[PDB]
């Protein structure tokens, strides 16, 4: 019935190619039922010290994809679930990722607030967390 590590396995079979991310994103977008489940799993995975920066950045791309495409699907369930964990994950990666990677996530999170992907309540928390880490 339920495939074990169905989400985890896909995260380890992705590439930095849009054709790859889209293949997993479109697969997740059809199963919005597990929105809160994949959201916490994503969060937990990126919080694991066993996950190298390569995998962290890869998983981050999948999040941007599903939350952005969710606008067309009109499924706020994804944005809601991923939004509450995004503020945490973004705050963590922004304090561990190098200069070259922080810049990449900057444009990723920028488009999220520019396109009003998440609620203003959490959006204001994400942007402030990024600035807080810059307070030394």
């Amino acid at each position: 019935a339920f495939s074990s590590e169905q989400f985890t396995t896909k995260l380890n079979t992705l590439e930095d190619s849009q054709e790859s991310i889209s293949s997993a994103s479109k697969w997740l977008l059809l199963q919005y039922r597990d929105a809160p489940k994949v959201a916490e799993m994503w969060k937990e995975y990126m919080l694991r010290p066993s996950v190298n920066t390569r995998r962290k950045l890869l998983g981050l791309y999948l999040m941007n994809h599903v939350v952005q495409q969710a606008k067309g699907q009109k499924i706020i369930q994804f944005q809601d679930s991923f939004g509450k964990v995004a503020a945490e994950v973004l705050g963590r990666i922004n304090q561990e990722f190098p200069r070259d990677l922080k810049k990449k996530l900057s444009r990723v999170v920028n488009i999220l607030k520019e396109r009003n992907i998440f609620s203003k309540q959490v959006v204001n928390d994400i942007e402030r967390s990024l600035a807080a880490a810059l307070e030394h």
Binding site: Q18, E19, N64, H65, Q68, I111
Partner: peptide, 9 residues
């Protein structure tokens, strides 16, 4: 191939 937010698919 490089992934950018403006080019997801």
């Amino acid at each position: 191939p490089s992934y950018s937010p403006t080019s997801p698919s």
